[PDB]
Subunit: 606 residues, 3 copies
């Protein structure tokens, strides 16, 4: 007996025996084993071979009934089994029989059937299709697949590796055999042949967050296969963010794409990017498309369609030296066309803060080809069924940023801006606009038949820079004259051109000066009716030959006086007592003897 025995501690060999664990070499080695009971917890030092790991706890229970898959439940003998206990929360795929440098695909498939978080720590190959437990985009759960150790996964499979459990069974059902809610992280995927390097199935994976991974050589990250939406393939709620990419064949290949994201990636020497609605365009062919904050350098075309893009953001990217593959052929980094049966216009697309450089190798690189987007055949500017791209605060030193005149350009630095038909903003072209109103008792305006309508005051202009105080202004002035009861019995309107000047090159002058010309005088008359019932007309308060004088008030303010004014009265409503004066002006901002602009903003109307 053992208690009789004495360890060199001075301890009973029994009192040792008690502080001791059941440990076996291999998981698969449990089948043999005697001398194990229900409630026994055992520690297996690896699954198969040690260089492959797979270590973890089992629990032995008394089990007659339940069949045994061969990893999660192992039959020790006819009436005893071991079930796998997960400790680390996330589970090595090794624990399921995954072997270093082999096809890990059956093993990932196996593991996900028992667990939701599953992790690779060893180099593997993916040669077969992984199906993934089916759940909808309303599910309680999120399948994770994690990288610890930066596992180097070689991709080599005739299909897209990853699919739904269901669709793996019928890979071709045009029935929506989909799985959602997946997170893939911290893995270096490594490609083989182009044809064999497709990682995810777009037909089949929705709501997938692919983040902080690494892709290398001839990988296609997502492919679509089956025509399933009026003759089109589609993908849905795919997001690729914070990955490195190198040599990548395609970021995504599909007919259509819903809700696709490509953010904060670092992509070197890739072949191609987002090829969507290329062969088979559609009217909406990308519906939400985000390309934010990537590096994409020394590379091919980043985006290529033949169909419409809807609700697109291409922001804060860095694009250096993209003269390769399709980019060198087509001489552009983004190529938006519309051609082929189904193909629609791009609409609602913002392109901002991107850097487009070093495409110098191609003397005629266009950064963003936008072809067949004309809708100049439409007879008005007033509808917005179709709206072209707006580009904003980008920077390009390529030959052209874009070739479509109807692209809206807002403060883009670009070569050959004065080649391009695109509209210049009033801001670039140093033009400003203001508007306001005055309400004025007539009492205060009327002098004989002179209506002292408005004062222009150039003191704010002078104050702020007498040099800058040289500008032309053009005003629309609309006057609504009102009876005491506030009935508009008379109205008139006129353009006014105003020139504000202050002599330069002799030091501070006494003041600024002002001239004005009126034109395009119009007013209400007795043919314009207020009430047919009680027989009431509008009137004409200005007489034969409208006359405007500029009154020089000698300190930098100017009255605009309007002549022959006559009051008219209604039996009902009385005479006019007051006027509402609505002014809208545009001013010249150039002030070419300074560093800055003209004081036109500061011209005051009282």
């Amino acid at each position: 007996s053992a208690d009789k025995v004495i360890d060199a501690s001075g301890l009973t060999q029994q009192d040792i025996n008690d502080r001791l664990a059941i440990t076996y070499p291999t998981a698969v080695g449990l089948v043999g084993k005697p001398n194990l009971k229900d409630a026994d917890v055992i520690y297996v030092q690896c699954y198969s071979n040690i260089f492959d790991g797979g270590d973890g706890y089992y629990r032995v229970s008394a089990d007659t009934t339940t069949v045994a898959d061969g990893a999660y439940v192992i039959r020790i003998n006819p009436n005893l089994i071991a079930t796998m206990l997960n400790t680390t929360g996330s589970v090595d795929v090794a624990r399921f029989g995954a072997v270093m440098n082999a096809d890990v695909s059956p093993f990932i498939e196996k593991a996900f059937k028992y667990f939701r978080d599953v992790c690779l720590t060893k180099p593997y190959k993916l040669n077969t299709v992984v199906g993934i437990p089916d759940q909808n985009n309303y599910s309680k759960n999120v399948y994770y697949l994690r990288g610890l150790g930066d596992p180097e996964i070689t991709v080599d499979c005739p299909s897209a590796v990853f699919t739904s459990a269901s669709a793996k069974l019928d890979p071709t059902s045009t029935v929506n055999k989909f799985t959602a809610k997946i997170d893939v992280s911290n893995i270096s995927f490594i490609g083989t042949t182009v044809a064999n390097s497709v990682v995810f199935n777009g037909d089949r994976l929705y709501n997938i967050n692919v983040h902080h991974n690494n892709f290398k050589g001839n990988i296609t990250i997502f492919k679509a296969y089956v025509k399933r939406e009026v003759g089109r393939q589609y993908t849905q709620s795919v997001s690729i963010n914070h990955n490195h990419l190198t040599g990548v064949y395609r970021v995504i290949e599909s007919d259509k794409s819903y809700n696709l994201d490509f953010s904060y990636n670092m992509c070197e020497a890739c072949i191609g990017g987002i090829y969507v609605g290329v062969d088979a365009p559609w009217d909406p062919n990308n519906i939400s498309l985000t390309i934010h904050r990537n590096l994409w350098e020394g590379s091919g075309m980043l985006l290529k369609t033949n169909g419409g893009i809807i609700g697109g953001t291409i922001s804060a990217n860095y694009f250096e030296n993209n003269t390769f593959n399709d980019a060198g052929i087509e001489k552009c980094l983004i190529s938006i066309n519309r051609t082929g049966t189904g193909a629609g216009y791009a609409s609602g697309l913002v392109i901002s803060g991107n850097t487009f450089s070093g495409n110098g190798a191609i003397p005629d690189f266009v950064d963003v080809r936008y072809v067949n987007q004309s809708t100049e055949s439409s007879s008005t500017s007033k509808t917005a069924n179709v709206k072209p791209v707006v580009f904003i605060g980008n920077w390009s030193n390529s030959y052209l940023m874009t070739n479509f005149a109807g692209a809206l350009l807002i403060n883009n630095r670009c070569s050959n801006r004065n080649t391009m038909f695109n509209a210049y903003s009033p801001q670039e072209g140093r033009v400003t606009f203001a508007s306001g109103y005055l309400d004025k008792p007539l009492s205060s305006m009327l002098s004989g038949n002179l209506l002292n309508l408005i004062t222009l005051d150039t003191r704010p202009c002078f104050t702020a820079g007498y040099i800058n105080t040289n500008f032309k202004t053009t005003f629309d002035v609309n006057v609504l004259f009102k009876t005491s009861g506030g009935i508009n019995t008379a109205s008139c309107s006129f353009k006014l051109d105003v020139f504000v000047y202050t002599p330069l090159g002799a030091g501070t002058p006494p003041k600024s000066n002002l001239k004005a010309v009126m034109s395009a005088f119009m007013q209400s008359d007795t043919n314009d009716i207020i009430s047919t019932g009680v027989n009431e007309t509008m009137k004409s308060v200005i007489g034969a030959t409208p006359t405007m004088a500029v009154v020089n008030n000698g300190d930098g303010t100017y009255g605009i006086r309007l002549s022959p004014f006559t009051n008219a009265s209604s039996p009902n409503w009385g005479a006019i007592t007051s006027a509402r004066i609505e002014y809208t002006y545009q001013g010249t901002l150039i002030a070419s003897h300074t560093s800055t602009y003209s004081t036109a903003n500061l011209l005051t109307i009282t």
Copy 2:
């Protein structure tokens, strides 16, 4: 004795004994134990029950003095204790006594008191309030709470589960009882009753990054409770990014919100989103608000306020089919109002690249209701105390995108654009603007009393498309005439209307042609003073009836010649020798016989 014994190795049973570890079943089982000494390191196979895990190392020390909490320090006997050793860096909550499917709340509270990274690997329930060690937003540290295994956490608590250690003690102090710097990740939170499913306390948690989690059923992710800032609740520096969301009752409920982020989430069939300043609006009621790059589909209202939003970005989102709950009632996805005591205007809000679709079910869906934002009562356009939303390159097929005329619209694709009073840009309405200057020795201009002022050159127009070379241009020309010493003794200004035409439908014509009309001629005169001291005036250099001729130079260039010009001289300064010519034009861009625009950009002024 043991060395006498012989294992079937041919090894001394003592030489075995030596390569062996102290292992016990349970952590709580250490209390009993004899035959343990100071420096002893022991391996416990689980805390309580095995199905719950909790396994890790202890160290036994000789300890008389220190009291024992019951997990981190366990009393083996009066003079011996075991302290917990953390290996995995992040610590299972199991190791503290957390049990599968129970309230994990005491256990999370316990663990965080000893460790900063704490991790859930087992399904649990949260039924009680977790307080969290108090630290300020200037702290050395970041509390993490991690998900391994996608743990399914059921939320069922009459308060917001997570709070500050302090505020858990007085849940109502209007004193700022806050904790900052928290990271929560990789967990599926699962809701019960609406009333019981609030996860985080906004009053109490600042600087919290909630990322790559999952929320399901009637969760409110954040609630605010106590009025604490002039009658308002507030939250601060909350960020929710890369989560899935499904059935979510509210993303956030509060009076006010500082610095709140909602990025790259995937949200299906949610009830409601960001309800802020709804019951109790305020003037700033959301101060920084980011809603970037989410999926939000088949859902309720995404954002609803009654107070002002300040510094808002709603970008690159995909919004399909949001006709539910409050969205179906109020017939909008975002509902910005101003009403109720305190309520202010929205100001500084950019909404770009969003996709707003399939709200067809409600024939009169408005995407963004913006109600009571009028400030048209203000008498000028010149102040920016209040500034409305700018919408830019979005896409909507809803009945209206918005209902406020003062929203700025830049290249949004939307239905009924010609319903809406919003200003059309000069770019949409095919108008362009340019400006420049010439400096010219008079010597080169003056011929008799003809001032050959400027040349217009339509060769650049013709070169680039003789068809497109049909446009009207309107120029403001300001001329500052200067003495040799560069004193501005004379100035004049005029409008010029220029029509550029090239006959179509007969092949390439010899050239483009040009006509012009001058108007709104004004000039300086002797009443405008340069120096009162030395008695110096401005002059008038153009005589009775200003006359402009267009000179046809026969090759596509045109002189603009100004008539009666007479020099004037100052005793001091001499005659005029040179002029500075400042031009500002606007041109028509429509060119309705082509696909493109008019050559107006390319008209050259020399």
Copy 3:
């Protein structure tokens, strides 16, 4: 013998012996050891001291030849060694001999030589330079360095801690001694002296994602050192996102920076931010620069340059109370200057949705100083070699947002907007623009010598609000007259001013009314040539004194009738049969008796 012995189980002490693991205390303790064979797998309970951890598996092999580093391979004796087995995938640095509160730098250097994922779980100090295995930005691999337990790392090193293996050897080579592809996460870095707290080397680390960490006290996150690009240092593809920051001395210090990102950080009481091209500016000195969605509060200057920024986004940030350090000196949060040899202009910079508040302490805070950016010396507005910043839907209550008049302002809420020379948009200043065309058989227009050119229709205006139906419109109308064979034999052009008025303050009137004035009439004449060959001219179809009448059609529609019209015919081509009518208008939108705008958008041209 052992099988003779009997454990209190009733089990043969041999049948125990068999279910048992080889366990030693310490890794370093293996050297002594006898009684171990090839294939033996052993479990070491810590590396050195237990409080430091380091526990993991070795494998014993028979080894004569290979030398032993002292952690990964340990010599047990002349012909036996132990190699380290990695289980957890990511490897504790402890396993390499890292000790609590010491310089972990040699140990990180050691570990990365064997593994790519390496993790800190214990407080340490970084006192020496860590070199990092050299790989290019096209590499199969990504070095990770992880945080578990929120390890508190003190930084205290006379160089930047982290560098390339190569550059650690020659720290000064102007040769491009770089390493790429690194991920650093979940660590609290803690600073000492400013001079000693630099974490990463910009010269040497490319493609580095620094995310979800914590920085505290006098840390400089990145420094550049060596002049290496035409007298400049540079950094490349650095991204700092989702960190906390507190007390941070500099986010980045460099001459130049390529492709730099600063996203979703939470930064409190920092000293300074992105100091780039300060001492030594350059023409492009930041090439791609993203500052998105940070908190930056109670802090110093966030960005400071003296060189050009190219392709910049500063979006959705919250900036409260930034009155400190350099911010209080220079009285600004961003300070973009151009000065010192090499220095260029900022170009292509979008600043949107930021919140700039509580800088009240400095009565004259400018949020974004933009100094020496004038390029008003350029003679046209038409080139875009240089383009200034565009600011859009930000919010500021600082004294000024910016001080450069040439910044483009789009719907920014800001103080003193009517101080600033920046152009007001036509939209703010309540101006709208539309354009279209009509094609019309002359047959339908011509009546005697009256050309009934176009109808204006104010019914759409009235329908939508008879109060708002008071506006001035100014139209450019260009008419291209065409022979049956569609040859443009005649053309004319005119301005038209149109006043649309409807009397207010008496209930719904019968209709809206309309007046118009024509001006700036021009037409083709026989001097304009179609074909010199076959001797063909353009003609004049309007006679002595062009006359336009407004025809009141009595229901809210108005003909514009043009007078003396005469047909002209070509021998070749016949008479004119049809005209193409191109209209471009601008309208006043103010409608100061309502909450909204004028109906000008809805005026219809048929």
